[PDB]
Design a protein around this ligand. Structure first.
Ligand SMILES: Nc1ncnc2c1ncn2[C@H]1C[C@H](O)[C@@H](COP(=O)(O)NP(=O)(O)OP(=O)(O)O)O1
Ligand SMILES: [Mg+2]
Ligand SMILES: [Mg+2]
Length: 342
DNA sequence: TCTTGGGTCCTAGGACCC
DNA sequence: GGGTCCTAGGACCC
């Protein structure tokens, strides 16, 4: 009993929306991120700029060395939110089984769909068309019998393409597939696996589960299953935000608490406004704060608390500021809150 | 070049409880 | 002594 699962993913999402809204940006290298003097990274970049080596996560310092004519934008969320909202209403036309992973991505289970003679392929195509019409924005898709393979599949023919994997093709496909392409395995993990000869799913299939469990725990079991193309996770549609927070990174580090306090003052309204959006009474399960020093270590203190409170956050922030820091600069302060349990 | 801001989920020790 | 809450931290994702 195989399911038909689609992963959709908008191409170069933030940049695409900029370039839509300003055709002049179309053929020159642009990126959304915080400027160099702001100590920012790149959020995303268009293809002209990727050409040069610009990636997401890359410090803006490096983006500009690498691509000195890089036009840099601060980004417009309402515009990204608006677009997201539309793409989702578009998915809704084809199924209710929709699980968004971020503004620009969603899984659809389309198994029990009656939409295109039950052709997953035709469905993805129909959604990539209609997203283009309607948004002037391209999207790529992956189709597969499970979440992670549709995920990997949606990258394989991007931009503005799609790619299908049938159950027939799966074992071939997993044989040479590098563990790192599996969601949940990044740098650190890949490096461990490698260091013990494991690089592809292929290699994990020759592996003893008992051992994978000894040295990664619940992660070993995931690895092991995914290697076999096993992925039982259902598209759910019911997930809710569990927390919210707000953080800022100074252009220069701060060494005096007077400054730190100044920062927090500026952050609380923002974290109040966001939380009101979702909880007018301001009722939370815990609040707390976050500091990250010059040696880039980061620490957080967070306790049970019943209702967002500016003073308490300033309080605990001073404890923190005293009791852990020992004279390093401080690059960022942030606040945080954990939503009630329902 | 010099390392964001918004989140998720997993681990682990000690408190607390039957 | 075996679970569950509390808190801190880390790897990961977009
Ligand atoms: N590390 C990061 N930090 C901040 N914002 C980020 C980010 N990574 C992504 N974003 C924001 C900006 C991104 O536009 C958006 C979507 O994330 P993707 O789908 O991973 N990347 P995109 O759609 O840009 O390129 P592709 O064509 O390969 O899909 O999330
Ligand atoms: Mg995308
Ligand atoms: Mg994405």
């Amino acid at each position: 009993g195989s399911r038909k699962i689609i992963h959709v993913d908008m191409d170069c999402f933030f940049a695409a929306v900029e370039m839509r809204d300003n055709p002049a940006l179309r053929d020159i290298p642009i990126a959304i991120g915080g400027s160099r003097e702001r100590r920012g990274v790149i959020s995303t970049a268009n293809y002209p700029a990727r050409k040069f080596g610009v990636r997401s996560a890359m410090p803006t310092g490096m983006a500009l060395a690498l691509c000195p004519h890089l036009t840099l934008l601060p980004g417009r969320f309402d515009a990204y939110k608006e677009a997201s909202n539309h793409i989702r209403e578009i998915f809704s036309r084809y199924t209710s089984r929709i699980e968004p992973l971020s503004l620009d991505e969603a899984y659809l289970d389309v198994t029990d769909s009656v939409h295109c003679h039950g052709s997953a392929t035709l469905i993805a195509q129909e959604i990539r068309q209609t997203i283009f019409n309607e948004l002037q924005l391209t999207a790529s898709a992956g189709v597969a019998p499970v979440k992670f393979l549709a995920k990997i599949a949606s990258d394989m023919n991007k931009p503005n393409g799609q790619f299908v994997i049938t159950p027939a093709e799966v074992p071939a496909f997993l044989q040479t597939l590098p563990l790192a392409k599996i969601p949940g395995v990044g740098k650190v993990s890949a490096a461990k696996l490698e260091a013990m000869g494991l690089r592809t799913c292929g290699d994990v299939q020759a592996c003893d589960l008992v051992m994978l469990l000894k040295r990664f725990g619940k992660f070993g079991r995931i690895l092991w299953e995914r290697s076999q193309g096993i992925d039982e996770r259902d598209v759910n549609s019911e997930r809710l935000r569990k927390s919210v927070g707000v953080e800022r990174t100074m252009a220069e580090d701060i060494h005096h608490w007077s400054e730190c306090e100044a920062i927090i003052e500026r952050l609380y309204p923002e974290l109040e406004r966001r939380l009101a959006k979702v909880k007018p009474d301001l009722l939370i399960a815990r609040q707390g704060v976050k500091l990250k020093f010059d040696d880039f270590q980061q620490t957080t203190q967070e306790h049970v608390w019943p209702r967002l409170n500016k003073a308490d956050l300033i309080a605990t922030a001073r404890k923190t500021w005293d009791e852990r820091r020992g004279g390093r600069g401080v690059r960022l302060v942030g606040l945080h809150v954990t939503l009630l349990d329902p």
